[PDB]
Amino acid sequence: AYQQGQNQLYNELNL
Amino acid sequence: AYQQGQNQLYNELNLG
Amino acid sequence: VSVRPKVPLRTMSYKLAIDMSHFIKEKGGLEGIYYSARRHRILDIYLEKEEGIIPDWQDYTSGPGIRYPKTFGWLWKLVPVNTSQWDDPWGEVLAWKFDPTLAYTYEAYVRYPEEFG
Amino acid sequence: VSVRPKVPLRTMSYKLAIDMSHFIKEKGGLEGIYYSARRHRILDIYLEKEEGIIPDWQDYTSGPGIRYPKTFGWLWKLVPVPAQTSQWDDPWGEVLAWKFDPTLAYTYEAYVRYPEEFG
């Protein structure tokens, strides 16, 4: 769930 | 001798 | 997806800053995105977890107005558009914007040299 | 004379390069002086012993022609102006000379012209 919630954040940067 | 040597080198660049 | 490997830490150099700037640029990230103290950290973690960059590089000029990168090489600045505790102190709405000029122009230091010690 | 005491080391920065550029110029150094790999090093020592600057800043574009500084803020470039060859001579067989240029402060000419020499 760690390296998955990180992707949630990255998307806010369109990354 | 060490300081005088380096100053000799500097003079080539017009320094010291 | 599957758990991905760690990346060997390293400080962001000029060339590394140029490379990271374009890489992200070509990905379609950052550009036009609204900025906040929160999303600022997200980026620190991104280049750290994805590229191993030590989070001591992302420093901008205080403001107001355009916020220029304190690290020479980084090609992303903060520009005003047109409450939260991640909000800009100057009460300005900020957004990321790619500036190629910043590859050979130290806008940050030439405009606000006093913000450097 | 008196032995000059050691100066605490520091890595050259943008402002430091600016300062040292003007400082050296105002003393009458470098300008119009024939560059060589040997004298290149004399410049490293000078700034190290006298200003404590780490000798890792003085890098130039490979050439030929004008050699631009790979440290932004360093306002000294190399400009072309030979009997028997010296092993301190330029690989392009060009005679180079130091030339001051304050323009080098506001444009990173090196990266602008030869982006490939970075990395």
Numbering used by the authors:
A (entry chain D): 63 to 77
B (entry chain B): 63 to 78
C (entry chain C): 100 to 181, 200 to 234
D (entry chain A): 100 to 180, 197 to 234
Would you copy out the relevant sentences from the publication that reported this structure?
Nef from human immunodeficiency virus (HIV) or simian immunodeficiency virus (SIV) is a 27–35 kDa viral accessory protein that is dispensable for replication but required for high infectivity and virulence. Notable among Nef’s functions is the interaction of Nef with TCRζ, the principal signaling component of the T-cell antigen receptor. In previous work, SIV and HIV-2 Nef have been shown to bind TCRζ at two unique sites denoted ‘SIV Nef interaction domains’ (SNIDs), the first containing elements of immunoreceptor tyrosine activation motif (ITAM) 1 and the second containing elements of ITAM 2. The Nef conserved core domain (Nefcore) has been described to be responsible for the majority of Nef’s interactions, including the TCRζ-binding activity of SIV Nef.
In the presence of the shorter 18-residue TCRζA63–R80 polypeptide the complex unexpectedly crystallized in the P212121 space group with severe pseudo-hemihedral twinning. Ultimately, a partially twinned crystal with a twin fraction of 0.426 was used to solve the structure of the SIVmac239 Nefcore–TCRζA63–R80 complex to 2.05 Å resolution. M was calculated to be 2.64 Å3 Da−1 (53.42% solvent) for crystal 1 and 2.64 Å3 Da−1 (53.99% solvent) for crystal 2, which is consistent with two SIVmac239 Nefcore–TCRζA63–R80 heterodimers comprising the asymmetric unit. Two nearby molecules (A and  B) in the same twin domain related by an approximate 90° rotation were selected to comprise the asymmetric unit. Clear density for the TCRζA63–R80 polypeptide ligand was observed and this region was also built into the structure, with 13 of the 16 resolved residues comprising a canonical α-helix. The P212121 crystal form contained two molecules per asymmetric unit which were no longer related by a crystallo­graphic twofold symmetry operation (y, x, −z) but instead by a twofold NCS operation, In the tetragonal crystal form the SIVmac239 Nefcore–TCRζDP1 complex and its symmetry-related partner (y, x, −z) form an antiparallel dimer similar to the crystallographic dimer described previously for the HIV-1 Nefcore. Structural alignment of one SIVmac239 Nefcore–TCRζA63–R80 complex from the P212121 crystal form with its corresponding molecule in the P43212 crystallographic dimer reveals that the NCS-related molecule in the orthorhombic crystal form is rotated by ∼10° from its corresponding molecule in the P43212 crystal form. TCRζ residue Gln65 additionally participates in hydrogen bonding to the main-chain amide and carbonyl of residues Arg103 and Val102, respectively, on its bound SIVmac239 Nefcore partner. Interestingly, this inter­action orders the proline-rich region in the N-terminus of the bound SIVmac239 Nefcore into a polyproline type II (PPII) helix as evidenced by the clearly resolved electron-density maps calculated from the P212121 crystal data for that region.
